[PDB]
């Protein structure tokens, strides 16, 4: 007799009513209300897992309760990012739908002048409005001031949305990132002919990576670039920053720096959210296990039919760990959670430790920079080697710190990297001492938290108060800012 399989499984083909350059989220809602409803789940902002969650608390704050701080924070962040915009505000990452709201609430962009002080390139991983802006300004876009687009964007309708990833006509997967396209091309891969399983990672690799901006002499001024030419590990990116850059400081010629730390005078690299580069050679990535496999797992929410979850959050919010439980159908959700925490707890604890020794390193170099006693004959050369190590240590811990998986994405790499960071920070302390003939030792004796206390409060507003810039010894390395009213409140002008 006949078959009863009268519906045959076929790969879905889509044809929308939308125009080829559509970017508005709300235009996608009528044709795909299911994925949209799922997309809207990103508005949830009250649930914490253990180390993560969607409460945008201050990541340097282990003091005040939620929503201001949390039991797992890094108290030393502001010290370590002295004189760099990250010392003003840096909070826990939350749902995609909040990208522009938070972008325009952050104190990192200046809101006490017309000019933001940062390039329009900050818009790069925030909005699919990036496509028109570039098509209109070309190479000239990047170097413009960030605040120049502040009021030319719909906060709800133009955040990271469907057009960031899908062709609005066919709904095929797209790479719309300029810098990612730049790498893909540099590798000989065609961004329109990419294997699916790669795409299910690369779509996120559009933004969840470590980046930098070209300086004036490195190519197109302020262009985003992924430092990936040497490979994906900390050593590889650090070696890339050895050869691509514009520093003119003796000892660091040709090297890149996001800023110089004003206490230690060390030329620093800044790392940001390197999920892609961490994931790619981690136990999961190495075996073809993909961001989408975990963060966009199939969920049977439409009757019993699969749709792709567009709720980008922690897999650990679902007590049944369903995203994991086809591949690990033999383990219980609780077993899996305990195996995640096995990595996370060690990593986070080691991070805090690696961060303390980095503060100590900066402090040692600061004392050696100012020392009035007898120096060694190789003082200058040793100060370089010292600063070189302050820079290397910080990069290594930043690499891990700034990474949102807290070890999980690449357990081995994460831990390895923190251990090396410790070695580097300490080698700096050793060198700073050698150079001062150990004369600084007496000033490095106690617990580091007494001699260099963690900086809990710092923003562009407080940096105006002369009384406040006296409360901590490291505040003397910063300038007192001029009295200014707030000029930008979100999108309106005061």
């Amino acid at each position: 007799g006949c078959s009863d399989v009268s519906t045959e499984l076929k790969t879905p083909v889509y044809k929308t009513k939308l125009t080829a350059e559509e970017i508005r989220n709300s235009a996608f809602k009528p044709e795909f209300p299911k994925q949209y409803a799922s997309y809207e789940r990103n508005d949830e902002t009250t649930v914490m897992t253990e180390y993560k969650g969607s409460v945008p608390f201050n990541k340097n704050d282990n003091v005040n309760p939620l929503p201001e701080g949390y039991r797992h924070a890094q108290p030393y962040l502001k010290n370590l990012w002295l004189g760099y915009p990250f010392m003003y505000e840096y909070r826990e990452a939350r749902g995609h739908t909040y990208a522009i709201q938070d972008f325009l609430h952050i104190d990192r962009i200046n809101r006490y002048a017309e000019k933001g002080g940062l390039p329009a390139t900050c818009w790069n991983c925030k909005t699919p409005k990036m496509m028109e802006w570039v098509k209109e300004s070309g190479d000239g876009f990047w170097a413009k001031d960030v605040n120049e687009f502040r009021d030319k964007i719909d906060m709800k309708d133009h955040t990271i949305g469907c057009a960031t990833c899908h062709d609005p006509q066919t709904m095929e997967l797209r790479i719309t990132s300029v810098p990612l396209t730049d790498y893909l091309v540099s590798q000989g891969k065609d961004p329109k002919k990419l294997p699916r399983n790669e795409m299910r990672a690369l779509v996120c690799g559009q933004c969840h990576v470590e980046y930098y901006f070209n300086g004036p002499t490195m190519g197109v001024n302020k262009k985003p670039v992924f430092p990936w030419a040497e490979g994906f590990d900390p050593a590889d990116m650090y070696r890339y920053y050895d050869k691509h850059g514009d520093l003119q400081v003796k000892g660091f010629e040709g090297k890149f720096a996001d800023w110089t730390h004003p206490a230690s005078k060390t030329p620093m690299i800044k790392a940001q959210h390197p999920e892609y580069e961490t994931w790619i050679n981690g136990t999961h990535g190495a075996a073809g296990v993909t961001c989408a496999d975990c963060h966009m797992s199939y969920t049977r929410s439409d009757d019993k039919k699969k749709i792709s979850s567009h709720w980008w959050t922690s897999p650990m919010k679902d007590p049944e760990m369903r995203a994991c439980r086809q591949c690990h159908s033999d383990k219980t959700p609780d077993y899996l959670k305990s195996r995640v925490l096995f990595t996370q707890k060690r990593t986070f604890d080691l991070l805090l430790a690696a961060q303390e020794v980095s503060v100590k390193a900066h402090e040692a170099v600061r004392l050696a920079n100012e020392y009035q006693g007898a120096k060694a004959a190789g003082y200058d050369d040793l100060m370089i080697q010292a600063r070189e190590m302050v820079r290397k240590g910080q990069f290594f811990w930043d690499y891990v710190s700034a990474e949102n998986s807290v070890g999980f994405h690449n357990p081995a790499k994460a831990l390895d990297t923190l251990a090396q960071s410790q070695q580097f920070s300490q080698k700096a302390i050793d060198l700073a001492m050698e150079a001062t003939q150990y004369g600084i030792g007496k000033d490095l004796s106690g617990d580091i938290k007494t001699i260099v206390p963690p900086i809990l409060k710092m923003n562009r507003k407080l940096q105006q108060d002369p009384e406040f810039m006296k409360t901590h010894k490291w505040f003397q390395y910063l300038p007192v800012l001029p009295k200014a009213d707030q000029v930008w409140d979100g999108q309106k002008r005061l």
Partner: protein, 79 residues
């Protein structure tokens, strides 16, 4: 298919020397995955689950005879 696999299995169990590893050949990976599709179409109608991984079992790993579970839950010595 039954007579070919049948014949080939009798031969392997008698005159041929099977290895320490028994693995599904290309052909059987194929007829199996097709039969995944045969019974679980409706769960998958709206989702390009066919294009992600080569076979369903690249996610549904344990449908492949519980390969992940400890040896002692699957196997003993011969008598």
């Amino acid at each position: 298919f039954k007579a070919i696999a049948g014949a080939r299995d009798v031969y392997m169990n008698t005159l041929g020397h099977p290895g320490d590893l028994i693995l599904a050949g290309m052909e059987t990976k194929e007829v199996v995955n097709a039969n995944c599709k045969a019974c679980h179409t409706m769960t998958n109608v709206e989702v390009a689950s066919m294009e992600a991984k080569k076979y369903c079992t690249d996610c549904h790993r344990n449908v492949q005879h519980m390969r992940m579970k400890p040896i002692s839950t699957r196997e003993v010595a011969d008598e």
